Amino acid sequence: GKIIGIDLGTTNSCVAIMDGTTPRVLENAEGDRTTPSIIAYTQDGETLVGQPAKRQAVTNPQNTLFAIKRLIGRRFQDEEVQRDVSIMPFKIIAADNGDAWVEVKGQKMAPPQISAEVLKKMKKTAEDYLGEPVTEAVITVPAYFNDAQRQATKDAGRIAGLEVKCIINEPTAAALAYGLDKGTGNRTIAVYDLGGGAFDISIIEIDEVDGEKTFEVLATNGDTHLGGEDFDSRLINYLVEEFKKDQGIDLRNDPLAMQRLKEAAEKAKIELSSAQQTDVNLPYITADATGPKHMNIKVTRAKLESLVEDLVNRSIEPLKVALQDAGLSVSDIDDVILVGGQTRMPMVQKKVAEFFGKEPRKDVNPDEAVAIGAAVQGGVLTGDVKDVLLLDVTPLSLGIETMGGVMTTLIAKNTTIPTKHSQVFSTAEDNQSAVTIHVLQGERKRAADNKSLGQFNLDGINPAPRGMPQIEVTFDIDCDGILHVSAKDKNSGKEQKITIKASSGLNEDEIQKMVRDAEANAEADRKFEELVQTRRLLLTG
Numbered sequence: 001g002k003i004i005g006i007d008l009g010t011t012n013s014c015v016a017i018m019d020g021t022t023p024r025v026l027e028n029a030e031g032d033r034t035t036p037s038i039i040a041y042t043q044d045g046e047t048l049v050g051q052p053a054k055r056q057a058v059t060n061p062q063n064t065l066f067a068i069k070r071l072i073g074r075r076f077q078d079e080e081v082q083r084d085v086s087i088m089p090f091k092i093i094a095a096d097n098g099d100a101w102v103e104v105k106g107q108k109m110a111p112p113q114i115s116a117e118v119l120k121k122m123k124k125t126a127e128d129y130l131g132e133p134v135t136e137a138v139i140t141v142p143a144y145f146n147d148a149q150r151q152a153t154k155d156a157g158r159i160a161g162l163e164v165k166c167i168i169n170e171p172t173a174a175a176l177a178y179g180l181d182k183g184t185g186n187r188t189i190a191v192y193d194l195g196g197g198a199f200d201i202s203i204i205e206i207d208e209v210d211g212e213k214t215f216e217v218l219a220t221n222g223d224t225h226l227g228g229e230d231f232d233s234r235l236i237n238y239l240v241e242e243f244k245k246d247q248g249i250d251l252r253n254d255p256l257a258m259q260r261l262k263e264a265a266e267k268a269k270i271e272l273s274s275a276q277q278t279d280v281n282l283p284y285i286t287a288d289a290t291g292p293k294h295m296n297i298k299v300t301r302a303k304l305e306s307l308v309e310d311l312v313n314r315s316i317e318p319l320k321v322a323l324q325d326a327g328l329s330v331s332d333i334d335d336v337i338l339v340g341g342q343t344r345m346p347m348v349q350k351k352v353a354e355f356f357g358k359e360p361r362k363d364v365n366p367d368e369a370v371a372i373g374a375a376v377q378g379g380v381l382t383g384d385v386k387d388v389l390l391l392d393v394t395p396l397s398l399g400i401e402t403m404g405g406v407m408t409t410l411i412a413k414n415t416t417i418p419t420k421h422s423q424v425f426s427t428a429e430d431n432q433s434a435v436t437i438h439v440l441q442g443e444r445k446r447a448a449d450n451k452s453l454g455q456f457n458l459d460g461i462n463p464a465p466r467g468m469p470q471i472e473v474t475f476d477i478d479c480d481g482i483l484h485v486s487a488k489d490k491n492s493g494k495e496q497k498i499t500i501k502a503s504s505g506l507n508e509d510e511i512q513k514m515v516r517d518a519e520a521n522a523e524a525d526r527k528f529e530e531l532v533q534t535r536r537l538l539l540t541g
């Protein structure tokens with residue numbers, strides 16, 4: 001029946017639903033509109049999720065899992081996983097297949113199983129509110145997630161007992177939330193998302209034509225090293241160094257103390273968005289031969305700002321790239337939307353307002369907008385939300401090079417995503433044993449006048465006259481905008497494939513120039529294609 005929207009966060013998760021025309025963020029049993037993304041396995045056999053898991057973490061560092069979003073869909077040898085292994089107090093292991101897993105109480109578990117526990121709590125929160133079963137969900141992911149990260153998030157959804165109707169990017173969700181307000185049509189917005197796990201920036205166009213409001217991503221990127229956990233780490237390091245200076249003890253080899261110090265640091269960081277100073281007070285933090293030792297360290301806001309200044313400044317460069325990739329100036333951004341708990345830091349707000357020259361909108365809730373927008377997309381799919389469309393179309397034609405240096409289109413410009421199209425090709429020479437699939441992007445008919453996106457070989461073709469072998473070429477663009485190209489020899493069974501990342505932006509200024517350029521050269525391109533075609537389309541070596 002109803003489709004719920006779930007923000008599966010590194011730090012916090014949130015669930016929302018469409019209640020007729022207006023979205024509703026749903027409270028859990030303690031009364032909370034967000035739930036810590038924390039899962040704990042206790043000595044007496046319980047599985048805790050949320051605030052109960054958080055409260056017993058500082059005593060159970062081994063069997064309390066958090067920040068599992070940093071692992072999901074990743075390989076054990078991935079750079080980020082290895083960086084994560086040390087800092088995490090729980091055991092991160094390699095699965096038999098090379099995926100990054102965790103081990104708790106001797107049980108080896110895949111991240112989607114762990115995240116499913118958070119998603120089940122979200123589902124139940126919703127089922128409790130509706131008095132009915134819920135099984136359909138829109139789940140969000142960072143815009144930087146790849147296919148494996150998305151698929152694994154879909155898995156966690158299923159393991160939680162959810163039909164995953166849709167995965168959408170978090171900044172897009174926030175834009176749908178904002179785009180519920182009136183007067184927001186025909187605007188460009190910047191979505192500045194500083195969460196617990198990463199920084200993301202997206203430039204999104206909200207247009208309104210013939211009653212339909214459309215949402216289209218013009219640029220995205222970010223940095224997984226600029227999240228609130230990185231802010232926390234700078235303050236932890238300062239608290240470690242200050243305790244060394246005050247009392248000559250290095251807390252880093254004492255896991256229980258470091259766990260208490262991590263939580264205290266985060267709470268102090270949070271408090272310093274409201275106050276000018278705060279006190280970190282941790283009695284019985286450690287002991288040496290002379291008895292127990294106690295921490296009491298005052299931290300001013302200016303000191304915090306000094307500790308994280310470089311982190312905040314490093315968020316500016318991805319903004320500049322995002323605007324370049326959309327072909328826009330700051331003067332084209334009609335509104336700035338802050339998403340994420342870490343944007344509540346006053347220094348972050350001021351730096352963003354300085355860059356854009358305007359104050360971020362204040363009627364967007366940075367903890368809830370992602371979950372709200374996911375619910376909006378849910379209502380779009382059920383038909384409860386009318387006249388709202390997420391627009392994802394190919395900017396330019398996509399194809400391969402064929403004989404004569406021709407670009408042969410498989411997917412035409414302005415095709416809606418996701419999409420899949422196949423065409424069968426053959427060989428250009430008798431007894432040709434291999435073909436080269438050269439993937440091309442653009443509107444020109446000569447392959448060399450278009451952009452090369454990648455290439456690969458298919459060999460093992462059995463000897464046969466030119467034109468006889470059947471090479472099926474498939475272009476599949478998934479919802480993440482990732483292009484999958486395969487080539488399969490139907491008679492030998494051999495197949496080869498590649499994956500082509502989505503572009504970081506859609507620069508309509510440059511796209512329309514390329515379109516006009518092709519139109520200016522249409523006749524020349526037509527004549528070119530014709531007297532080459534006087535020779536089923538064929539592939540050279």
Ligand SMILES: Nc1ncnc2c1ncn2[C@@H]1O[C@H](COP(=O)(O)OP(=O)(O)OP(=O)(O)O)[C@@H](O)[C@H]1O
Binds near residue numbers: 069269340
């Ligand atoms: N008032 C505040 N001032 C500064 N930081 C805060 C404040 N409130 C929360 N935070 C920080 O916000 C971060 C979590 O924000 P949020 O809940 O948006 O993350 P998330 O959506 O779970 O993460 P991600 O988007 O990476 O998956 C944490 O690092 C937390 O310490």
Ligand SMILES: [Mg+2]
Binds near residue numbers: 009170195196340370
């Ligand atoms: Mg988030």
